[PDB]
Amino acid sequence: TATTLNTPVVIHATQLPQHVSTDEVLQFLESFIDEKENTNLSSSISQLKRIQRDFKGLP
Amino acid sequence: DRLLNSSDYTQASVCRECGSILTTQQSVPRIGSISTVCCRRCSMRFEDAKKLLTEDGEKIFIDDSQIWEDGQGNKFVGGNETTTVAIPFVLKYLDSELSAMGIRL
Amino acid sequence: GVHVSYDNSIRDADGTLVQFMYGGDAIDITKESHMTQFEFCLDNYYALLKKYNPSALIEHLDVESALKYSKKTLKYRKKHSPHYKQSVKYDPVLAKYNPAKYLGSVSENFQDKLESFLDKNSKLFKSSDGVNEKKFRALMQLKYMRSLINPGEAVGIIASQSVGEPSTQMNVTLGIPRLRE
Amino acid sequence: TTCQFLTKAVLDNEREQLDSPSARIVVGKLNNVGTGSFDVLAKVPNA
Amino acid sequence: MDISKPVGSEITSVDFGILTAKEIRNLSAKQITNPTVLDNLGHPVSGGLYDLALGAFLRNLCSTCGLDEKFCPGHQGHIELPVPCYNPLFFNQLYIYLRASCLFCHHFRLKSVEVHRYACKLRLLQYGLIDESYKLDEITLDISSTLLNELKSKRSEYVDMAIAKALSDGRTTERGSFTATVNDERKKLVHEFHKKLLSRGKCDNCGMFSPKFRKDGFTKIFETALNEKQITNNRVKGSTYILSTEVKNILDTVFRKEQCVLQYVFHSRPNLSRKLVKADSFFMDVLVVPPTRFRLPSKLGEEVHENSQNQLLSKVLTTSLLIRDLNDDLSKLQKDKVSLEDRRVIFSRLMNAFVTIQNDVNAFIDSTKAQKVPIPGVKQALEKKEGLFRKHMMGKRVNYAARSVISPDPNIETNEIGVPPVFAVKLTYPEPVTAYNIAELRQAVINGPDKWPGATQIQNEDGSLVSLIGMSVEQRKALANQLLTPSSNVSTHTLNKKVYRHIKNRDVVLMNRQPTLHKASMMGHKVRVLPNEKTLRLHYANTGAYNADFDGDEMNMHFPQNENARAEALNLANTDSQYLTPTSGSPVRGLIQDHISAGVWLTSKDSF
Amino acid sequence: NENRETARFIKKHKKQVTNPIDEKNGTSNCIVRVPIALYVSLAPMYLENPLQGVMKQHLNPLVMKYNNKVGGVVLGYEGLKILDADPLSKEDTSEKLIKITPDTPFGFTWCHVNLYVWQPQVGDVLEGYIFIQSASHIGLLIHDAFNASIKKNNIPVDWTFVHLGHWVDSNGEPIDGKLRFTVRNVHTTGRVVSVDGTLIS
Amino acid sequence: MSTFIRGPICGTDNCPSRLWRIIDGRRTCQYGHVMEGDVEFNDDEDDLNGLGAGVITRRLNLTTNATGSFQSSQLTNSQLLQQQQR
Amino acid sequence: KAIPKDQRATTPYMTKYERARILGTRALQISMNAPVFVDLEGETDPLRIAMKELAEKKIPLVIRRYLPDGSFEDWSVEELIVD
Amino acid sequence: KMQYFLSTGNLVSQSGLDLQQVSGYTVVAEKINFYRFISHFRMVHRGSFFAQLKTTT
Amino acid sequence: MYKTEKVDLALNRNRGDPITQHFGFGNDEWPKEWLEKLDEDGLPYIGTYVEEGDPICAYFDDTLNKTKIKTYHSSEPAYIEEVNLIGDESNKFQELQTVSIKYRIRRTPQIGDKFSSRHGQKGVCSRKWPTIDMPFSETGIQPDIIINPHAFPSRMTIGMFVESLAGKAGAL
RNA sequence: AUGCGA
Ligand SMILES: [Zn+2]
Ligand SMILES: [Zn+2]
Ligand SMILES: [Zn+2]
């Protein structure tokens, strides 16, 4: 991903970020990973799942 | 298609913050650092950097002269004919300039 | 830089307006040749009706607004049929309705010649099998709409070539010295 | 008199709005005449 | 061009404007100080015109990007001019503004309130409010400073009303208002303005008698003596050559003290940038250094001739070194210089050397401003008769094009062009491969570059190019069975391979014949490959549109490389759409000579 | 005037937030959700899945990856919205419109999406499970995602070696499992992000 | 032996061979694939009025465009020539 | 700049310039694996494919007619009278 | 020097030899055809300077 | 059509010095297929067919320790008609540094090649008509050249008509 | 630039 066909030309935020709670973070993790599970990005999702476990309690 | 696409069509760097396509350069990489596009005009010499009144960490990029820079990371690529680059040579010698506009600068 | 805006006005690529219509009729030269050859169109009427069949398009436009202005303008024109005593109450029909949208918005010169043809040929309309000056007039209006200059035409350049190219074949100064002067 | 018009332009700090077809060619831009008189977009399904 | 590499940062306009020495120093990749060009009799001199920081050279990586001559875009250096040079291009300007000032007060010799009136008019013409610009003259009422300042108040109030209204009315915008007529009224105004500025033959703000200013023509200004009546009149109100430096400090002070008017004087549109109008714009305190890329030597066959810019610029470096030598006299002289009056020759070095450096900088800009056939400068490169703009911008050479003598042929269509197999094998279309064209393109690849409907090259979606020019039937056969492989990298998954196929019977080509006197002389034809031809084959029906004749006429055949160019050349420029000319609407395409006599004989009632 | 340039340095180099320690017992909320607007290309082959097109093209490579612009490794995205090129809807429609470049079949569009970013800062005190122990560093892994290492020089000499041997803490027992550290630096310039930790503050 | 590379190698496939297609203007892989450079320079048109005193002239100390990727050479001291003639 | 559709005042017909550009761009997209909405019916030239799509209005494109003011009218192929 | 002048046709001297031009005096015999060869020696030129004139008188 | 080429070794100025390149070889590693064109003295065999790319001479420069060749670059083949060795004007020149090679390029009448009568009525050959397809006279002949009549009404080259009838009489 | 094909 090195050119327009892969990388965004421009990115701007429109407000100052919002500090997602642990509960909001975990709910996002489960919803995002669950929606994604349904291609090397899957492997990064596996790391996200470990993050889920780390934000779930236990490695 | 003819007078460009089939002749000197070049995707050239332009600084979205300085409106020129000739200050752009490839910044020097390192064993842990890739080549990054930097705009010379949109960067400060690391010897100054308000250092007297003042870092993010990753906005200094280095020249083949091993010179540290701050900024210059706002340049992009746009399609133009290369002779255009030829103009800054003479016109830019003439002490004039192109403010090559783009998008949201 | 000189081209046709989408509003039929000739603007330069700057935006400066040059003419409110192309030659004042919005007619393409590459169309005009028969746009005033009515009798020819008539003897080949059914073919042109097969080309320009209006029933496909009669749903996309208005066939009256321009025709109605044609009615008021026909009134002032029959009343005022001296030049400085102009139709100041009635601009030409091309001024009031986009000629590509309301069939009948046509130069008064073209309208006049067309009607004069219909009057001087009423006897061919008394020699035909199935044709009338209302359906024939409808056809000629539709041909006129279909001869209009397209939005975006490079008419500036076209003009320049139409003066240059034939000037290569070329009491007072004539020819190139006159044109250069 | 390219340089003379150049001088009068720079002294004005002029900005080219890059409408002239020649100028538009200079920057390698779709010519504004004819087929470049308009833009084309696409209707795409959102779901 | 590649359809596979879009960009979405197109330029929307181009601003013009003067550089700044601090800008140059900050962007400058290097200062070039050494008038040397090569070193070790054969090496790029450190800190000279060919320093490697200015790009790549002869295997040496660009010392600023470490990139080869095939990659480093090059970087522009700069020269620190010992003294501020006059900018030739604006030299007439700085001259005018010099003659317009007052030398005892350093103000413009026009009434301050009248000047402010001029600034008002030019401000209203940034917004193009012409009616108000003319309506401004009417505001009218020993004259008190309170009253002339009252005119300035009322006039500024008029600016506030006409602007506030016009922005309220949307009859302009923050970005100004610009049309051909506004530009015209501006140039007219600025001209009469220049006439008023020149008209004052004595000061008004200060009443002082300024000296007459004379100039050499392109390197010196002189200051004429005054009359004892005017000199003693100036005291009761209480030609010499001058250097550029003094001019700079004077025009600096005048241009700063008169910034308020000049802010609108130097812009035809609102200066949103709050840019100071500085006198250093007309002078060159420094000189840039072009990219090495554009300074490459003239090698003709084997012999490589030095770049003419390098020559003139080296002349700048030598002359500058001489000025460094006079500065050697100042550091040298130093010790008071009481009566060592000989400095009269070193004074010849400063005056002569200094006018010399200016003359040489001018010469580097414009050959016709220096003092047989002196290498042309950038002005000559850009114009001279037609110029760089005309010879390499308004028209260029183009790739995918051919030229050959045209030969008639009645058996082809009137919309086709017979392409000789010499051209049929060397003109390609970059065909993206699909599910519907896989068979045809696999076959074309199988044929290879040296046969009919084949393809010379394959461009991967990864960006790589694969030439088939020299691949064996085995290797091309193998690649034909690999043309449809799947994606490999998420960076490239959206693309499909490309095949550079030979031109074939489904391609349209844009034929052009010499004096394009009119658009009808350059039409799109459907390509028809003719075997055993060597010349571009053409139907007679076109010869009255090209004004062509087989006596020996040559035609350019252009092969467009893009589906937009195909669709336009098949739909707009195509020959059939060119059956009538716009000049008259007379048909330009019909049978000719022999076909006419055949029609006369065949169509006789006597022919059965 | 000489203060425009210092306003340019401070106003250009301003920092948005200082993620604090959650409850002052957790970790700094360096994880934040920020809605952004990106401008991405759309190929024609995704012309029938435009939200999925934009996803597979630009957003999928962004997860588990550092963004200089956001200042961190994208933790995830929320609420993608393609900005319609043409006014009037009921903030919604069965088809959108998008600009095609004036040269090629590729599309370009505005996009609005919420990003979940891990935005760590220097000084945050964090705990990690010891990855490695070499005589110049201790490797740890934050949340099982971010690699962190504290080099010997940044570790207090009061720490104790036990022979890649086994470091023993300043208290007099060897370290094990999780370690609490302050963030000195985060090294992202390379193929993988590295978090610079300290044991001396 | 000597090595290959004193200019370019195909970083794609590990094939260190190079082709010249003078008709293409292309430097390409002798065995494998792709474009080794799109850029191609110096084969001027019909416009060399020769005002250029072109004082430069090659002398083998500024190298050469290397237009031969074919190489072997050796380390040199600097113009054998005198040692050759000796 | 958006001239409302209810207010569109321009030519119901596609200019030859419009037809040309639409056919070029749409052909190019189909040639880049845009989903074909019509029977390929054997064809191999993407341009004639785009012509088939134009004849059926399957083209999913809209014309942005510019006015020198900057106002524009967004027109579908499926409405602008093809010929 | 005379090979010089004969190889370029730029005859230059401090008198200008009373000639309106300083080039074009010499031509390559161009033996591509016997007709061409004999024709050079029967060619007579009004001189380049009149080639520069705009009129045709 | 004959093209003459000068292969010069005037590589080094200074009016002589070193001069070291000699037509021939040294490393043997050269492609022995070069013998297919150049004699073991480095010059092509007079008479040799050459096609684009073939070496026109071979020599050796001690500076490069390599056997180099000057290639012929054209779109069409020729034949080497004569190769002339130039030692002339030289004082010593023992190295044989100047060689002149003359190429013979045959030019067959071809579609597009120009032809003209003595009447300034010039025309390109549009095609090489098969003899069977030519028109044949009752004398049993088919013409050499066919010129379109439609040319005469504008040009009024009636002298060419007279030359036709005079050449016909004069042959009979 | 000089001569020349178109
Ligand atoms: Zn910049
Ligand atoms: Zn560099
Ligand atoms: Zn004064």
Numbering used by the authors:
A (entry chain D): 12 to 49, 80 to 100
B (entry chain B): 1090 to 1143, 1146 to 1196
C (entry chain A): 1029 to 1109, 1112 to 1200, 1214 to 1224
D (entry chain A): 1617 to 1663
E (entry chain A): 1 to 141, 172 to 268, 312 to 444, 450 to 686
F (entry chain G): 8 to 170, 214 to 251
G (entry chain P): 1 to 86
H (entry chain F): 72 to 154
What text does the study give?
The large ribosomal RNA precursor (pre-rRNA) is transcribed by Pol I, accounting for up to 60% of total cellular RNA synthesis in Saccharomyces cerevisiae. In addition to recruiting Pol I/Rrn3 to the ribosomal DNA (rDNA) promoter, Core Factor has also been implicated in transcription bubble opening. To gain insight into Core Factor’s role during Pol I transcription initiation, we obtained a Pol I Initial Transcribing Complex (ITC) and determined its structure to near-atomic resolution using cryo-EM.
We thereby subsequently obtained reconstructions of the Pol I Initial Transcribing Complex in three distinct functional states, with overall resolutions of 4.2 Å, 4.3 Å and 3.9 Å for states we respectively designate State 1, 2, and 3. Compared to State1, the Core Factor/DNA complex is rotated ~10° toward the front of Pol I in State 2, allowing the upstream promoter to insert into the active site cleft, whereas the Core Factor/DNA complex resides at an intermediate location in State 3. In State 2, the movement of Core Factor/DNA correlates well with the stabilization of Rrn7 zinc ribbon/linker on Pol I. This likely positions the Rrn7 linker region close to the single-stranded template DNA in the cleft, suggesting that the Rrn7 zinc ribbon/linker region might play a role similar to that of TFIIB during Pol II transcription initiation. In addition, the recombinant ΔZR Core Factor also failed to recover the defect in open complex formation in the ΔZR extract, whereas the wild type (WT) complex did. This data, together with the finding that Core Factor complex bearing the ΔZR Rrn7 can still be recruited to rDNA promoter, indicates that the Rrn7 N-terminal region promotes transcription bubble opening, consistent with the State 2 structure. In our reconstruction of State 2, we observed the Rrn7 zinc ribbon domain residing in the RNA exit channel, similar to that of TFIIB, consistent with its functional conservation based on similarity at the level of domain architecture. Additionally, we observed stabilized zinc ribbon and linker regions of Rrn7, in a conformation similar to that of TFIIB. Thus, State 2 may represent the state of bubble opening, following promoter DNA insertion while preceding initial RNA synthesis.
